[PDB]
Amino acid sequence: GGPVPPSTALRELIEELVNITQNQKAPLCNGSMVWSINLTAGMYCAALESLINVSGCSAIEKTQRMLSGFCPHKVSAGQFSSLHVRDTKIEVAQFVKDLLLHLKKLFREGRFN
């Protein structure tokens, strides 16, 4: 019943993720690795759960919150008892970039939901 979807919402994830990924050679904060994203499906809660651990930056926090809004679950500070989070540790730099990868591919493909 309504015209095309909100395109502005796309430019948001595009410029934001492009900004974080378009950073100097130095990684995020201090190159603190984290549990690689799960671009497979529920990658939102993934990047949110790993990024939430960040402390002393507040630069990515924006992407964190915006990611939570979609995160199909709960993942904050100290709230895990499954022991199914440890898998592959990757540099926060490549981490963010990957986040931009899947995120842009989703919001762009139209399967952002």
Residue whose C-alpha is closest to residue 20's, from 77, 75, 59 = 59
**3-state DSSP assignment of residue 94:** helix
* Phi, psi dihedral angles at 99 (to 5 degrees): -60, -40
**3-state DSSP assignment of residue 90:** strand
> Are residues 31 and 96 in contact, defined by beta-carbon separation less than 8 angstroms?
no
Measured CA to CA, the distance from residue 99 to residue 110 in angstroms comes to: 16
Q: Which residue has the tokens 């915006």?
A: 66
Which DSSP helix (H) or strand (E) runs through 34?
Answer: strand 34-35
The domain segmentation of the chain, as residue ranges, is 1-113
Q: What does the block give as tokens for 48?
A: 């949110």
Helices 61-68, 8-21: inter-axial angle, 10-degree rounding: 140
**Angstrom distances, CA of residue 93 to CA of 21, 23, 60, 65, 100:** 7, 9, 11, 18, 11
Q: What does the block give as tokens for 7?
A: 């395109």
- The angle subtended at Cα 29 by Cα 18 and Cα 98, nearest 5°, is 40
Tell me the fold of 1-113.
Growth Hormone; Chain: A; (1.20.1250)
Helices 92-109, 8-21: inter-axial angle, 10-degree rounding: 160
**3-state DSSP assignment of residue 89:** strand
In 10 A of CB 103, how many CB atoms? 25
Measured CA to CA, the distance from residue 9 to residue 25 in angstroms comes to: 28
